[PDB]
Structure formats: structure tokens, C-alpha cells
Write a protein that binds this ligand. Sequence first.
Ligand SMILES: *[C@@H]1O[C@H](CO)[C@@H](O)[C@H](O)[C@H]1NC(C)=O
Lengths: 48, 48
Amino acid sequence: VGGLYEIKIPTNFTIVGQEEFIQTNSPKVTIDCSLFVCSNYAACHDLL
Amino acid sequence: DLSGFTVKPVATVHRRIPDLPDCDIDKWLNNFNVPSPLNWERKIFSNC
Ligand SMILES: *[C@@H]1O[C@H](CO)[C@@H](O)[C@H](O)[C@H]1NC(C)=O
């Protein structure tokens, strides 16, 4: 309108909080391949 | 991380139903009235 534009400017405000979880680690899984594949069985450990 | 061990069994548990009769399987197999393949006979042995 002439040289001027209509703008909504804030007249009041507050502070808002926002949470953000970022994963940086995970459970350190470890496998005993021999115990998993063959358990206690000697005949399996031989073939493995 | 060394290979997985298992605790050694310290005793043996053996269970069987006592005082069951003999199955007599030989008496039935040695019976001289032998059937042909056409009329092959069956016997079922349990609790013996
Ligand atoms: C701003 O907003 C808060 C919450 O609605 C209110 O308590 C406060 O009086 C307001 N201030 C003005 C200048 O409007």
C-alpha cells in the first residue's frame, strides 16, 4: 500500500522447551560362536 | 574372552518304572504258526 507492507509482528512471547534424544551408543553384543553353534557337545565341536 | 565352559555334572539321575514284566518278544517271534505276507501279524509291546 504505497511503499508499505502488512506484517504480523509479535506483541508478546514465552520461552518453550523441546526435548531431543540422540543415540550415541548401543548394547555391546558379544557372541561365543563355538558355544552358540555347538553347546556342550564334543561331536559337534569336532565337526565345527 | 576365552571359550565358554559349562559346570560339570556332580551326579547322575536315572529313573525307570520298577517291577515291569518282561516283553516276551522272543516267544511271539519263535511261535511256529507263522503268517504269510498277505496276512502279516502285528503285536504291540508297552509297559514291559
Ligand atoms: C503476555 O502473556 C502472558 C501469558 O498470556 C500474560 O501473563 C502477560 O500479561 C502478557 N503481557 C502482555 C504485555 O500482553
